Amino acid sequence: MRSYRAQGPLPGFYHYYPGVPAVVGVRVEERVNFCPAVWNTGLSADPPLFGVSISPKRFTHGLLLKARRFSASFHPFGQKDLVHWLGSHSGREVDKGQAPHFLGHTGVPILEGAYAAYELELLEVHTFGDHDLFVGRVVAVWEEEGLLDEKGRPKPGLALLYYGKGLYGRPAEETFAP
Amino acid sequence: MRSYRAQGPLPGFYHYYPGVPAVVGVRVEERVNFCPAVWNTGLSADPPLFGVSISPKRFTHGLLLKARRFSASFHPFGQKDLVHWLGSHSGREVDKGQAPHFLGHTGVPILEGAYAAYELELLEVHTFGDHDLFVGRVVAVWEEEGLLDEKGRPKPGLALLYYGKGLYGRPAEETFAP
Ligand SMILES: Cc1cc2nc3c(=O)[nH]c(=O)nc-3n(C[C@H](O)[C@H](O)[C@H](O)COP(=O)(O)O)c2cc1C
Numbered sequence: 001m002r003s004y005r006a007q008g009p010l011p012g013f014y015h016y017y018p019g020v021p022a023v024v025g026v027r028v029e030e031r032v033n034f035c036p037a038v039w040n041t042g043l044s045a046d047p048p049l050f051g052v053s054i055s056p057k058r059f060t061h062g063l064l065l066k067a068r069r070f071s072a073s074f075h076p077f078g079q080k081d082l083v084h085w086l087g088s089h090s091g092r093e094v095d096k097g098q099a100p101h102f103l104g105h106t107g108v109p110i111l112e113g114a115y116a117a118y119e120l121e122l123l124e125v126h127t128f129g130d131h132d133l134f135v136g137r138v139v140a141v142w143e144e145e146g147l148l149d150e151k152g153r154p155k156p157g158l159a160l161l162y163y164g165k166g167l168y169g170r171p172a173e174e175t176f177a178p
Numbered sequence: 179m180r181s182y183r184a185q186g187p188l189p190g191f192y193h194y195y196p197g198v199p200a201v202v203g204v205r206v207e208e209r210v211n212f213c214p215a216v217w218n219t220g221l222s223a224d225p226p227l228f229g230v231s232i233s234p235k236r237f238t239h240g241l242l243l244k245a246r247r248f249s250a251s252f253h254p255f256g257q258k259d260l261v262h263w264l265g266s267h268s269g270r271e272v273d274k275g276q277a278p279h280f281l282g283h284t285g286v287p288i289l290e291g292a293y294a295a296y297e298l299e300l301l302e303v304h305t306f307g308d309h310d311l312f313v314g315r316v317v318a319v320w321e322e323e324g325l326l327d328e329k330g331r332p333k334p335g336l337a338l339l340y341y342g343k344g345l346y347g348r349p350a351e352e353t354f355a356p
Pocket residue numbers: 021033034035036037038039040053054055057058059060061083084086087088089090091092131162
């Protein structure tokens with residue numbers, strides 16, 4: 001097993017991939033934007049808190065700070081092209097609001113085709129190096145009827161997985177319950 | 179598409195799964211513990227920062243606060259049984275240090291068999307509801323040659339995935355690069 005001491009950013013920072021990209025939806029007045037975020041994680045069960053790490057370089061960063069409300073939606077493999085397209089262009093150069101979406105209960109935009117989505121109120125924002133963590137409280141839930149299993153778990157093979165640097169995949173259908 | 183307002187903890191909080199479980203290794207004096215953490219994410223590229231969200235109920239939590247150093251290791255689907263075991267029992271009841279492991283450059287314990295691992299210096303801890311986010315700086319990197327690709331991602335299909343509530347999988351073999 002090879003090793004090295006870190007001396008700055010890693011030659012690839014992909015060791016913990018793949019991950020499910022969360023699609024971050026945000027609205028400020030008429031303007032809707034979407035941004036995939038693979039740097040995402042649950043943060044608390046009670047209360048339900050979910051976080052997304054967003055670079056201050058993203059158009060989405062300013063919109064979140066203004067809106068203080070956002071969606072995180074989770075999309076099937078079949079939407080790989082759309083998710084990659086949302087993550088390869090900025091709202092500085094393209095109205096990604098033209099992407100098919102709807103407004104949730106709190107008025108946050110939610111990208112269409114998702115098997116699940118959270119509406120979130122922004123609770124806190126924390127800077128860690130070159131990204132800011134946006135901590136949202138889940139205030140509403142959208143779920144596709146039957147793309148989730150008995151305990152609320154997305155069905156094997158369905159989820160879009162991101163491997164980093166524009167490489168995508170999906171879970172295998174085989175599961176293990178040891 | 180079904181929806182509801184959040185009224186406390188969610189019936190299932192698995193909408194964003196599967197994820198790669200990071201195995202969190204920690205050492206205090208002669209005592210070594212491990213803890214899988216599916217709530218994990220990259221937090222910064224420059225500098226390289228990585229977070230794990232750990233409940234104050236975990237034996238690991240106090241050890242992390244004392245040691246200020248830990249590992250995060252990433253394991254192949256073959257080690258599904260070991261990873262599940264480590265997150266099914268507490269260091270309060272069983273010496274998990276007995277799991278085969280080595281010490282890293284900075285003396286953190288790294289569980290054997292990982293395709294990759296970080297040695298981390300603890301930078302910050304933040305409370306978000308019922309879990310604490312431990313923000314580590316990657317100070318060293320371990321890689322299993324030939325299990326990672328050209329850019330550093332684990333080879334297609336190798337990663338252990340966790341679906342929540344004791345269910346596991348792996349990524350599909352096929353990858354797609356739009
Ligand atoms: C699959 C995928 C995952 C991504 N994950 C993140 C992320 O976690 N945080 C982030 O700041 N950018 C991430 N990006 C980059 C942004 O999505 C990308 O810069 C996007 O064009 C930003 O659009 P915006 O400027 O309209 O906000 C990701 C991109 C892709 C394709």
